[PDB]
Each structure stands twice: as structure tokens, then as C-alpha cells.
Amino acid sequence: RELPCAWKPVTYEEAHAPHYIAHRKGWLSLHTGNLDGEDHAAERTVEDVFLRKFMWGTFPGCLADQLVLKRRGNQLEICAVVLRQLSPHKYYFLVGYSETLLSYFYKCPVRLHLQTVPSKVVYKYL
Amino acid sequence: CRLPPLPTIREIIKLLRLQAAKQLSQNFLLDLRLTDKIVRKAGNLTNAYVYEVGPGPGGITRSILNADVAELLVVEKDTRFIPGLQMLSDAAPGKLRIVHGDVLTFKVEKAFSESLKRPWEDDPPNVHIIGNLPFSVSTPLIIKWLENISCRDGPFVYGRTQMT
Amino acid sequence: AALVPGVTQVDNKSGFLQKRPHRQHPGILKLPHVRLPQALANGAQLLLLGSAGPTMENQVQTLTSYLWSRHLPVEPEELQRRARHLEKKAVLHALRKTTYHWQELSYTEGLSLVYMAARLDGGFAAVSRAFHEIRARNPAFQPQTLMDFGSGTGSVTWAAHSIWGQSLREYMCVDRSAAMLVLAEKLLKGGSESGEPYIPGVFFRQFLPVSPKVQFDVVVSAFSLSELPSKADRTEVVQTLWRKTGHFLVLVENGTKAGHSLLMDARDLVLKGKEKSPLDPRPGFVFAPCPHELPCPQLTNLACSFSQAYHPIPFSWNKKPKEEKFSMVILARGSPEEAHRWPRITQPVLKRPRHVHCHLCCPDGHMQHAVLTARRHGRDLYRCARVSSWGDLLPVLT
RNA sequence: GGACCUGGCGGUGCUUCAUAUCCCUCUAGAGGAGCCUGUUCUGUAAUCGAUAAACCCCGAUCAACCUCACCACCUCUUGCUCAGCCUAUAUACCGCCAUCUUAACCCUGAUGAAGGCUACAAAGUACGUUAGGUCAAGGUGUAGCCCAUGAGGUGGCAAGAAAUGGGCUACAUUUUCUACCCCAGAAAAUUUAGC
Ligand SMILES: C[S@@+](CC[C@H](N)C(=O)[O-])C[C@H]1O[C@@H](n2cnc3c(N)ncnc32)[C@H](O)[C@@H]1O
Ligand code: SF4
Ligand SMILES: [Mg+2]
Ligand SMILES: [Mg+2]
Ligand SMILES: [Mg+2]
Ligand SMILES: [Mg+2]
Predict the structure, then answer these.
(1) Which domain holds residue B46?
(2) Residue C95 touches partner A, C-beta closer than 8 Å
(3) Taking burial as the number of CB atoms within 10 A of a residue's CB, which of B26, C42, C327, C371 is the most buried?
(4) Tell me, which GO biological process terms does this entry list (chain A)?
(5) SS3 sequence, chain C?
(6) What's the CATH code of the domain at B154?
């Protein structure tokens, strides 16, 4: 009205700041590359970048949170948390498509472990 | 005429090197409207020889100068105001003659020209006196000038000079 | 478009091209790095001997950034429109956000010391450049009376002294802050409460005289109108200053969108005469930097500013030379001297191999981005543009 | 006109102390010489301007006949290839940095303006913003010139003086060299921290 008269939900990962990565949060990606003595950290990092952009472009508006990228031997598990807004048939079609495409792109047995949630799991409001 | 600004009370206090507002021992009329009124009541001063006494800060001086006076003779006793009156004189070239002296002793019969000296029976001789002095000095002055009128000497050698 | 390739040629009056090199062409208004008078710097450092530690550096940096990024106070109507839009799309909170909280700065003693230490040299540099404009283009001007609204530390007074001290006899300095007035007096007295003034004739007032009868040769307002709380206050102040202006009215603000908008409002106010029968009937024109009285071509999205480089007062934090970015407008009484007015370079000139980029505010009221080259524009005009710089004038005709 | 209430002086001083930040006091080092940079003045037709682009490879370096930039003259051009140019713009966006802005209930006064504490207790309890920088470890566009902002050639250009701001070297007798790693022999003014 007059000058004297005048005078956002966050999930757990969004709420907590980067200085909590080993105190309260964890690591979204888990691989042996960064351990002392291991190699190919850069290649694993670039792989993670492509996986994240690909998955966010292949499941638009479905992903509730960040992906979890696990790696055991040459396996590659994408644990994603998606919403129940898209039809399950489309979910199965996309799961098959993305698994096959990523296995042929990384020449390794990729796998996907979707977890549907009714809606965004809000932790606090910032 | 671009006359300099009228001193404020703070500037006056600094000028007297007094550093306070209680020990003035003097009152100033720093309102140019009242001084304009006084000079208006002094009569028509256009091309008149005015002998002004007790200028001080100079409200009367500026008011008289605004009127088309021919020459204005000023007599100041406090030398501390002479700088302000000198800047005022520089603003008005040739219309202000400052004299440091005491009005009870200053001799006016020699100040102005002799061509001004009009008979007693004719009209007042185009020479006017205006004054806002301390009240401790204006009454000796008026008594002295009344004696001068009775003797027709002093400021009244010019004729029947009017006083305000 | 004041540069048509192959048609426009350099303006040769007083036998220019023959009798003097290109680096000294008359539109060269560049001022070498400004260094404050030694008395002023000594006084500032003496006054700050009391407390100039690590806290003072932080305070100066904070105040400088706060003043630089301060916006104009938002007028009622803009708030009303924003409120309607938000309502169409709680509203009060959304207005607390996305609206600038403009607050009055109460200059007490401590904040006056901080402001002096943060802005004395910058203001001096900006005002000196603005005054050099008049001095360089009209060297026969000898002002005798100067008034400066919002005289904070006396930087305007010191710059006017440094330029026109052999003629100026009266420096009226208006400032509502008693602390600022006291600090200006101390600075003028060599940083000591008792002393003899360095500049004679300085009058200090706490209120702005409002009367058309008294009229000054130069009226100045530097970084002052941005302190006023409303557009109505700015309007009345500018009207008073113009009424009391005798020859030149010099308005200087920060080189931001806010400062440029303020100065363009003032320019329009002065150029569009509203008073029915003013005591002074002379018309007003824009002496600098605009070569025209038409609306600013650049007020739509951008701003317009000029830079003056200077040496800061020595401190624990001032080591390297600085740049002062400021917006200016000088309004002169009467009419333009001639019809051969020249474009103004309002942006840094970029020198590149065999061509020069210059952005010009032309006399027709439009901006021109000109890439001057010898083959297209003529060797003499190319040399003139090559030696020219930001804030200069380009001598071109037809 | 009478009575009463809240005010407003972000006011002014004076008294005592808590009086921590901030001050001083105090402690230990930092001016000369030789080079390199910042600003001014003077001077040239002109730049003592730069090397993902020279040379020197002990280190580093000046101007090099590298090359680009500048000044004075010239030449091409339908050409390199539907050619060619860090030319501009983040004052085009995006990235990155930085600037600033962001209650209720219950009592008392006659249910007036209004007020509510006593402990051996007397109504009190509950994101936007910016003519911002960055085109060097990053991108998507937009415009310029295209007989010249493209490509060449012939000469020049290689500055001078201070006062001050800053940087690098060596600077010793409580030193230096050898043997040892500590009982040997030979040589000769501001400023930076304080804790
Ligand atoms: C902060 S200074 C700006 C710099 C100053 N003009 C200079 O040249 O150094 C502006 C001053 O204007 C004063 N001011 C603001 N509004 C005023 C007003 N309405 N009348 C008189 N002075 C005013 C304030 O006291 C403020 O200190
Ligand atoms: S852009 Fe031109 S017209 Fe606008 S303020 Fe600047 S000089 Fe004046
Ligand atoms: Mg090239
Ligand atoms: Mg370039
Ligand atoms: Mg920018
Ligand atoms: Mg050279």
C-alpha cells in the first residue's frame, strides 16, 4: 500500500548444506575411484554426469529426488525415486529403454531400481 | 547590487571571538524587513547623503544601500565589524565610506561637500542621519545634537538635517 | 547519425588541423589523474588519526557499497501497480521482497567520519571533471559566487577553489547535518578545530535559502539529490536551485541507473519551464554532456556515465589509483553558443588494429555506434577519433 | 475555551561506576645501492604498446632485423577455399564471482484517552537487484567491414626529466669455508607482527 505500511519446501538433501556431506548427508554416488591408490576417478565422474543428465531428461517431472548411483564390479545400479503421476506402463517402457541404452553405451550391465512415492518428501521449509 | 549575505547570530558570535550566546551584551536586528521599514520611514533617500551611525552587522546599512543613496558615510566603533562593512563596500563601489571612530566625537561638518549647505529657512539640506545605536549612546548623542541645533553648528551646518 | 562515411569531415575552426597536432583537438576534455590538494589530504588524515584501524576499513567498504547500490525511493504508484499485479497472480510479504527498502541515512559524527573517509576523494574527482568541462569549453568564465546544496565535506568547495580561486569570493554551503558542517569547517581549517580557513568567503548554512532574488554564478549539487526521500522533494529542490542559478547548474550523481534517472528527471524539469512569469526569464539549455535538449536516447534500458581516474587519499587501505564513475548534467542559462555542437563519447573508446569503436550521443538526439577507419572516414577524422577518449567530444560537421 | 493523556526531541549535557570492542604505552624487525613497474610534466607524423606469436636455456633479460600494434607513402581484391578478421556485444543470454534489499487470552481505570509490578509476593499468563567483473582452463546467440575492420610492400617508430607509490637481488664477525652436527682449524618516517 504505502512505503511505511510495507516497511519453499526442501527435502533432506536440499535442506542440508554442503558441509554436512559426511556428517548428516551421504554421497549420492558410491564407487571405488576416489579411494587412495585407485584409478579412473575422472572417467567415473564423467559417467555419473551423463547418467544424471540422461535420467533427468528421460524421466521429466517424475524424479522426486536425486539419483543414487551404486557400482559393484562392472555393475551399475541406478536407484531413483520417482512419482506415481506417470502411468506404470510408460514406467516399464522407459525402464527397459534406459537400461538397454545405458548398457550398450557403457558396455556394462546397467540396472534400474525405481521407487515410487505419492509426492515429494518434504523435510523442512527454507 | 549583489550585496553579501547578512551575518547570522552564530557568525556574529564567532566574529566577536566570544564562543557563546550569553555574553553578547548587545542586541542585533538581523531582520531585513524591519530595517527596510525603518529606512522607509526615514523618507525619500534617492540621491541623498546619508550619515549612518551604529551599523553593527549592517541590516540598516544594507537597507540604506538598497535605497538609491548618493553616498553613505558609516561610523563604526568596534573594529571587528569593519571587515564585514568592507566586503559590503566592495559589493557597492563608491557608495560606502567606512570610518572607525566614536560618534560622540566624530566631526560631521567636514564629511560632506560644501555645496550641500542650504539656508536654515529653506528645506532640509538633502542630508539625512539614520541610527540604531546602543541605548546607552543614543541619548548623549541626541542631547549633543540638540545643542548643535541650538547653535546651528555640527551636522546642522548643512541646514535643517533630519534625524531618524 | 553524426558520422556519415564519406560526407562528414572534421570541423576546422581557428585553423585547427594546420596549427596544432591531433592529440590536442578541442574535444579533448580528458583530465589527468586527479590528486587532492595537500591541505585537504593532511586534514582528512589528521581528523582520522583517532580511529583508522581494521574496523574503519570494513566500515568504509560497507558504506561505499551501500551508497553505490542504493536505489531511488519507490513512489506510491509503482507500489500500487506491483500490488495489483501480485494480487491478480501474502502480497505484502511478496512486496517486502522484490522491492528496495530505502532508508534515511542520519549522518551523526561517526557516520560523517566514515563518509568523509569513503567519499571525499571520489566526490572531488567527479566534481573536478564536471568543472573542467566548463573551464575548458568557456575559458572566459570567471565566477564570483558559488552555492553547493548538500555540501557534505566541502569537496565541491575545494574543487571550485582549485579551479576558480582567483575570482570566487563566496562559497555558500548548505547541509542539514550539524556534524557534517562541523567536519567541513575542521577540514577547511587544516583538520583542527582552531585555525585559519584555507579558502576565504565560505558560508555554512543548515537550511536552503528559497528566494529568486539571490542568484549565484554556479550552483552545484553532487551526490545530494539521491539522499532526498521523495520525488516531490527532489522536484522542489531542483526548482529552487534552478531559480537561484545565475550561469551554471551542475548536478552530479553516481554512475548508476538510479543516478542517471534522477539527473534526467532534473534535466527535463529544468528544460520544460513551468513557471508562468519567473523573475529571471532567460531560457535554459544543456551545456554538457548532452549535445541536445531532446529526451535522452539511452534512458530506456541503459544509463549514461563518465569516469574520472584519481589518486585516493593515503590510508591503510588505499594503495592503487581508483576510478570514479559518475553521472553529470550541466544546465546553462541563455541559449546554445552556436549551432556547431559536437557528439559526445559516452562509453570507453576501443582501439583495434586500423579501426576505433566509439559510441556517440549525436546532436539529433540518437545514439550511434561508429567504427571509424581511415579509408572510410578520412585520415584526419580517424586520427582525431584514435586520440579521443571516453567523455570527450568529436569535432565533426555536416 | 477548560481538564487530562501519549508524545516528539534517534537532542543536549553533567555524576558515578561494570567499561568488554577501540585506544594508546610497551616489545622485535623493516630507509642506502642496482634494476623493473604506477602517476605527472615535456616531446614526436608515430605505441620506451603486446609474445596460447620471438629470442635466449646457467638463471633472467633489453631492445630483437621474428611477428603483431602505431605514423608517412603505395599496391592489390573478385580474391582462399560462396573467401578473410579475437572486431564488437555477458551495455546479448546461461555458468562463475561480487554489490545491495528482504499474536492471543485475562484483569484494572465508572468496559475515557489508557494501564497491568512487589517472592514473608498485592493480576498477570501464554528471492529479487546491478549501464557490476569475468570470453584464460565454460557454453547459445546477435550484430559489424567484406576496393577493406581483408592481404601485401617501402621507410620510420626504439622517447626525456624528476617527486613520490610498489616489487626483485646482495647487504658479515652472534659472520664465512672445511671437519663435524655443537669442546676444532683457517679466512676476513610510517609500516609489519605481538595475544
Ligand atoms: C551525503 S552528502 C553527499 C556528498 C556531498 N554533497 C559532497 O559533495 O561531499 C549529502 C548531504 O545532504 C544533506 N541533505 C539531505 N537532505 C537535505 C535537505 N533537504 N536540505 C539540506 N540538506 C540536506 C545531508 O545532510 C547529507 O549529508
Ligand atoms: S546519453 Fe546523451 S542525452 Fe543521455 S545523458 Fe548521456 S549525453 Fe545526455
Ligand atoms: Mg589482424
Ligand atoms: Mg582484442
Ligand atoms: Mg557487464
Ligand atoms: Mg616501438
Answers:
(1) 9-164
(2) yes
(3) C327
(4) mitochondrial translation
(5) CCCCCCCCEECCCCCHHHHCCCCCCCCCCCCCCEECCHHHHHHHHHHCCCCCCHHHHHHHHHHHHHHHCCCCCCCHHHHHHHHHHHHHCCHHHHHHCCCCCCCCCCCCHHHHHHHHHHHHHHHHHHHHHHHHHHHHHCCCCCCCCEEEECCCCCHHHHHHHHHHCCCCCCEEEECCCHHHHHHHHHHHCCCCCCCCCCCCCEEEECCCCCCCCCCEEEEEEECCHHHCCCHHHHHHHHHHHHHHEEEEEEEEEECCHHHHHHHHHHHHHHHCCCCCCCCCCCCEEEEECCCCCCCCCCCCCCCCCEEEEEECCCCCCCCCCEEEEEEEEEEEECCCCCCCCCCEECCCCEEECCEEEEEEECCCCCEEEEEECHHHHCHHHHHHHHHCCCCCECCEEC
(6) 3.40.50.150
